[PDB]
């Protein structure tokens, strides 16, 4: 639909501008001239501004000869100082070309956006190769991941090839027929889940840039990826269920909950996810419900929050000490959000916190300790590496009740 609704008319400004500016008959603009503008070793951005700003006035039928010069020079557009207007205009022209030649254009753009370490790095990517493995379109130059106008293009190609692989697999299944439907459906679901997981890993603030979260390229890339994931979750909520059963890093959880409006359906399978045998699934379910209760304060959200509190209270008495540490260190900050969303949960959360703290003080008393937190029972409010896990868990309990009291007082 995104490749079709762009053809819908708005106000007649484009036909007017075409009629008033394309009649200048300055026919110097050509794929050869634009290629010479790109291929200048002392590259000038002004000339390519002039050419592609003229190109925006062209119709989609007459923008066909510029497809090769527009695609094959996209590697130069990532070269650390290309102006944002060049990238936006190239994205606009690619979106225009997507309406008349998308099957060729996706192949040319995938071949253009390779890392190109080798001489070709498999420039022979055909349409069949991309329909077989749609995740090829995520093996780009890796500088595109902070280039939002090229994230728009690569997300368009990713969504297109993910849609095309379903038809390709159905065609191959019917051709080789001369069960396998279940295996095809499992392959498709795992393929979409893998695409979502790779997209979420693109959203992560990688450690090269870690050492202003709103006015960065990462924010725009996160918004584009969140829009694509919203569309894909609407198209198939089972993909969202499969992805959240697989799980992603919890740093992405506030971003996914805030940026994807179709994340409220995760409350349907969070009761199912919290019953999973693996501890990581329960940790991720509690951490996901933590942000979902802040985003959506539903009565059913309160019911699932009560369920999660009961699950944590039961896992306090089921898990061993190492498992108690590994489970309660990530899930303790979720109780602050549970108390923020649901003030009726204060009694249950505080009784649970008393139980966890009194359990965790006992095995502190069991072994000799390097810092002995039992003596430090009279400590003031502290300011917001090789320590013992039990003492770390005790300090986590104290920190979580500090945040709960600070939140409820305010």
């Amino acid at each position: 639909v995104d490749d079709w609704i762009c053809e819908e008319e708005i106000t007649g400004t484009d036909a007017l501008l075409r009629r008033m500016l394309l009649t200048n008959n300055a026919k110097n603009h050509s794929p050869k001239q634009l290629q010479e503008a790109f291929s200048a070793v002392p590259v000038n951005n002004t000339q390519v501004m002039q050419i592609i700003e003229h190109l925006t006035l062209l119709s989609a039928s007459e923008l066909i000869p510029y497809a090769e010069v527009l695609t094959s020079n996209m590697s130069q557009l990532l070269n650390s100082g290309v102006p944002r207007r060049i990238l936006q205009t190239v994205n606009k022209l690619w979106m225009v070309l997507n309406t008349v030649m998308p099957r060729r254009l996706w192949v040319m753009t995938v071949n253009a956006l390779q890392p190109s370490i080798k001489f070709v790095r498999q420039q022979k990517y055909t349409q069949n190769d991309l329909m077989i493995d749609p995740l090829i379109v995520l093996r780009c130059d890796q500088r595109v991941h902070r280039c939002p106008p090229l994230m728009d293009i690569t997300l368009h190609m990713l969504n297109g090839y993910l849609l095309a692989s379903k038809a390709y697999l159905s065609a191959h299944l019917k051709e080789t027929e001369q069960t396998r439907e279940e295996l095809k459906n499992a392959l498709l679901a795992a393929q979409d889940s893998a695409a979502v997981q790779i997209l979420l890993e693109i959203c992560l603030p990688t450690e090269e840039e870690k050492a202003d979260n709103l006015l960065c390229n990462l924010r725009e890339v996160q918004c584009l990826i969140c829009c694509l994931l919203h569309q894909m979750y609407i198209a198939d909520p089972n993909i969202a269920k499969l992805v959240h059963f697989q799980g992603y890093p919890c740093e992405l959880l506030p971003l996914t909950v805030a940026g994807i409006p179709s994340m409220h359906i995760c409350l349907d399978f969070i009761p199912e996810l919290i019953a999973q045998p693996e501890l990581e699934k329960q940790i991720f379910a509690i951490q996901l419900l933590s942000h979902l209760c802040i985003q959506y304060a539903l009565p059913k959200s309160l019911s699932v929050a009560r369920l999660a509190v009961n699950v944590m209270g039961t896992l306090l008495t089921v898990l061993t000490q190492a498992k108690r540490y590994a489970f309660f260190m990530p899930t303790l900050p979720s109780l602050v959000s549970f108390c923020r969303a649901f003030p009726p949960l204060y009694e249950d959360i505080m009784s649970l916190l008393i139980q966890i703290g009194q359990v965790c003080a006992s095995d502190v008393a069991t072994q000799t300790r390097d810092i002995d937190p039992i003596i430090t029972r009279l400590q003031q409010i502290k300011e917001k590496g090789s320590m013992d896990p039990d003492v770390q868990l005790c300090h986590c309990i104290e920190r979580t009740v500090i945040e709960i009291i600070n939140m409820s007082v305010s």
């Binding site: 979750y233 969202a240 409006p261 179709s262 409220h264 359906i265 959506y296």
Partner: peptide, 13 residues
């Protein structure tokens, strides 16, 4: 439904 917010107005036929 994933296409509608939980706080969105309900549709009554």
């Amino acid at each position: 439904s994933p296409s509608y917010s939980p706080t969105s107005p309900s549709y009554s036929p």
